[PDB]
């Protein structure tokens, strides 16, 4: 019933902005306050701001005084969150949250999430590098510096899964990122790496 | 102002009960709410006021507390509730939210060794100018793992990098992916890349090795 959607997320560079949105719906929207909560990547929930049901009465985390300016429309049922001179360590999936009904110092709905990602690195798809008297042998593909995320990878097509494993990325100190994707076996092996942000496509048989 | 999840990992079977604890550094005025959120999805409300479900959630998720002291109580264990759960705090004014670290409710298992593979950096790359030589660490449990570098046996430190995938649908095990990134250069300086795996299941550290 009760709907929280965000938009508004994506990669931008240092010190420039970026302005998110989280459309509710099935409550009446003004009569809750509303908060924002970031979750960088591999850490932990932190608070970031709140604005109150009557939008008069707004606070935020130490980390993003000044910067960042947290609204709402009541007619529209929307919040917001204008971010401004963003820094790298700001990157983040943001989320929107409700203050709940039965209980208003938890929060009982929360919006989908919407990444933001700030960085200076550049657009580019990924090198695919091969990675080539036993029971069972392993095998793989080096998907190397990309950006940003994601990238999917897949084995003859998909037609082979079993004993696939398919590496979370991990961000370089080139602010690029590279992962692997391998697979063990006791033959042609193909993965199909696909990077939409640079419309690069790659099958490389190892 | 903060909150105290213990313990930072919890290993349990399905079927079994389990306890996550959290602990406020000082009184709180109102009681804490408790959170359940899955890799790459928006954290989910299940209890409220230290006691009450949120709607939606079954009746083995249950919580108590007051003061300082919190707990959130999983009956018996369900394959999806295996996850990370957060405990939360806020109050009227000023009007901030605390988060605890959360605690990983994660499947236990019987050991298994990881079965190891080094991986020397392709010529493809190579001719690019710089050199990644990987290590895996194949379909191992529990989680604690040790992987060691070394170049001509000079142990390497603050040069590489590793990803871990999730617990394994089937077989609940982990896998580990190390890589070690060298400049083309000091690639072809050196001859043996070894890499040495520590794991409960290995009564002996396992060495993977070869001579560029």
């Known amino acids: 019933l009760i709907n929280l959607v965000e938009s508004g997320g994506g990669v931008v560079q240092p010190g420039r902005s970026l302005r998110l949105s989280c459309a509710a719906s099935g409550f009446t929207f003004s009569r809750y306050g509303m908060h924002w909560v970031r979750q960088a990547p591999g850490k932990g929930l932190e608070w970031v701001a709140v604005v109150s049901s009557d939008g008069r009465t707004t606070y935020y985390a130490d980390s993003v005084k000044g910067r960042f300016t947290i609204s709402r429309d009541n007619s529209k049922n929307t919040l917001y969150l204008q971010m401004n001179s963003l820094r790298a360590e700001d990157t983040a999936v943001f989320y929107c949250?409700?203050?709940?009904?039965?209980?208003?110092?938890?929060?009982?709905?929360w919006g989908q999430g919407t990444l933001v990602t700030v960085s200076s690195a550049s657009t580019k798809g990924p090198s695919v590098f091969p990675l080539a008297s036993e029971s069972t042998a392993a095998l793989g593909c080096l998907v190397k510096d990309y950006f940003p995320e994601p990238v999917t990878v897949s084995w003859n097509s998909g037609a082979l899964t079993s004993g696939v494993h398919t590496f979370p990325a991990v961000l370089q100190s080139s602010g690029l990122y590279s992962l692997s994707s391998v697979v063990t076996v006791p033959q042609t092996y193909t993965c199909n790496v696909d990077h939409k942000p640079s419309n690069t496509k790659v099958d490389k048989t190892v | 102002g903060q909150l105290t999840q213990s313990p930072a990992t919890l290993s349990l079977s399905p079927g079994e009960r389990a306890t996550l604890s959290c602990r406020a550094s000082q009184s709180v005025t109102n009681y804490l709410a408790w959170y359940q959120q899955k890799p790459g999805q928006a954290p989910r409300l299940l209890i409220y006021?230290?006691?009450n479900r949120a709607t939606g959630i079954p009746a083995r998720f249950s919580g108590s507390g007051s003061g300082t002291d919190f707990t959130l109580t999983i009956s018996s264990l369900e394959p999806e509730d295996f996850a990370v759960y957060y405990c939360?705090?806020?109050?009227?004014?000023?009007?901030?939210?605390?988060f605890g670290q959360g605690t990983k409710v994660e499947i236990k298992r019987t050991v298994a060794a990881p079965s190891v593979f080094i991986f020397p950096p392709s010529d493809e790359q190579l001719k690019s100018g710089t050199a990644s030589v990987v290590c895996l660490l194949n379909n191992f449990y529990p989680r604690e793992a040790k992987v060691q570098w070394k170049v001509d046996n000079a142990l390497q430190s603050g040069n590489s990098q590793e990803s871990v995938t999730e617990q394994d649908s089937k077989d609940s095990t982990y896998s580990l992916s190390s890589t070690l990134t060298l400049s083309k250069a000091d690639y072809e300086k050196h001859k043996v890349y070894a890499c040495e795996v520590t794991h409960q299941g290995l009564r002996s550290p396992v060495t993977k090795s070869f001579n560029r």
């Open positions: 939360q705090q806020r109050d009227n004014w000023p009007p901030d939210a605390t």
């Open positions: 006021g230290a006691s």
């Open positions: 949250a409700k203050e709940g009904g039965d209980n208003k110092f938890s929060f009982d709905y």
